[PDB]
């Protein structure tokens with residue numbers, strides 16, 4: 420079954436399973452193989468795999484990792500994906516000295532927003548965007564990967580799993596326990612990633628849910644009824660929260676120009692209803708001169 | 717959050733056509749009949765109530781069962797095995813906290829073993845080519861609900877009840893698409909409760925009119941009128957609960973005046 424693939428090396432461990440780099444011996448194609456340990460007398464095919472496969476087969480887009488095949492065994496389940504060269508996290512670390520040039524930041528953001536707009540349009544929430552799940556190739560592309568936490572949503576949404584999104588990239592409506600969250604949770608995440616590409620550091624690196632909230636409040640201001648109607652009735656909202664003043668965005672990501680700060684602020688709006696959609700973001704003036712620089716790997 | 721509501725509705729309209737079961741498959745099934753399918757479907761309603769499963773889960777299970785039986789011949793003593801695996805897959809796809817495999821073995825009062833349930837899971841996945849994110853009557857209703865003015869909880873619950881009834885009888889509901897059944901159920905519910913009709917705004921959204929909904933609607937009206945007498949009664953029982961405003965005991969209209 421896996422006779423045509425030669426494993427080259429282990430790549431990492433994401434939401435579920437294990438990812439290896441492999442090469443197809445007949446075609447030459449390098450692939451990433453996600454290997455799923457299955458069994459009988461346990462729970463069978465894991466839900467994460469069922470959702471990932473069914474949704475990825477639907478999602479064909481240049482900024483979404485491509486699922487090429489599913490080799491489904493009685494023992495193991497293998498997902499064969501196109502191979503990407505590295506993750507954004509590793510890229511930022513390597514650009515430690517240089518920094519990522521604005522044209523590259525802009526192209527990567529524009530591309531991710533196309534990827535995301537495509538998911539949302541197809542009723543899919545990603546729910547785990549972070550630099551380890553954003554993969555880059557040697558042609559200037561960046562793609563969404565690790566759809567193991569994804570799910571299909573309904574219109575209007577009902578309550579879905581609360582335990583979602585890595586903490587540093589987690590939206591305030593999730594931290595405050597809202598019974599409904601939607602697409603705006605993925606935008607909040609990409610907004611933090613936009614900030615991080617520029618400053619080369621996490622915007623909100625909290626180590627607990629309350630630390631995370633307080634770091635967001637110190638940056639964006641403690642939200643009240645005026646900024647966000649309903650916040651004070653939210654389940655984990657506390658009237659004892661300190662009341663920090665909002666900071667000017669020029670101070671939040673100093674190298675960013677006015678259009679950039681204007682986009683960032685819209686992607687980090689507290690009220691998930693007013694937070695900009697990926698689709699609408701593509702038409703933001705920040706992208707007026709966007710190109711696709713090929714990165715210095 | 718409407719920025720994608722029409723993209724999504726469009727895409728589901730495309731996918732219901734790709735995920736549609738074959739309309740005449742029961743005539744190609746040697747050993748099972750529409751009536752054995754009803755019993756299975758009625759038992760799944762009970763299993764969903766026992767485990768407090770989402771309605772969406774049940775609608776997806778049924779879709780899985782009808783698509784599998786469209787290509788796979790199954791003996792009567794195995795049909796519940798197919799149904800158990802389908803409910804397992806649906807719960808995994810849709811539920812925050814799905815029942816464990818052992819709960820599914822138990823619900824069949826040990827007619828089958830875990831190993832058979834898990835092997836059937838694998839075969840359903842293979843036959844459906846892992847294509848589990850199917851549109852359902854429920855997903856369409858929930859969007860149509862947004863067009864009410866004002867929202868009426870009874871109209872919503874009654875529309876859900878009617879759509880659920882449609883899952884039970886393959887003759888005639890397999891010939892109709894989810895979006896169309898949802899149209900008929902919403903109109904029938906809205907009419908029963910409020911006197912009002914399929915709104916103009918849903919004509920603009922769906923392209924469906926009362927004339928195009930007619931055939932499904934006459935079928936659904938009869939089903940609604942005969943529900944207290946049908947051999948399967950679990951949906952009628954479920955919709956007596958306060959969670960669904962007791963809608964199953966509203967009186968159906970005697971005529972629709974179309």
Ligand SMILES: NS(=O)(=O)c1ccc(Nc2nc(OCC3CCCCC3)c3nc[nH]c3n2)cc1
Nearest residue numbers: 431432433438451500501503504505506509565
């Ligand atoms: N660390 S790194 O920079 O050395 C490097 C990273 C990722 C890859 N390549 C690659 N990885 C995948 O999942 C890898 C996986 C690891 C765990 C976190 C989620 C993502 C893919 N899934 C489809 N295609 C994939 N391609 C190559 C090098």
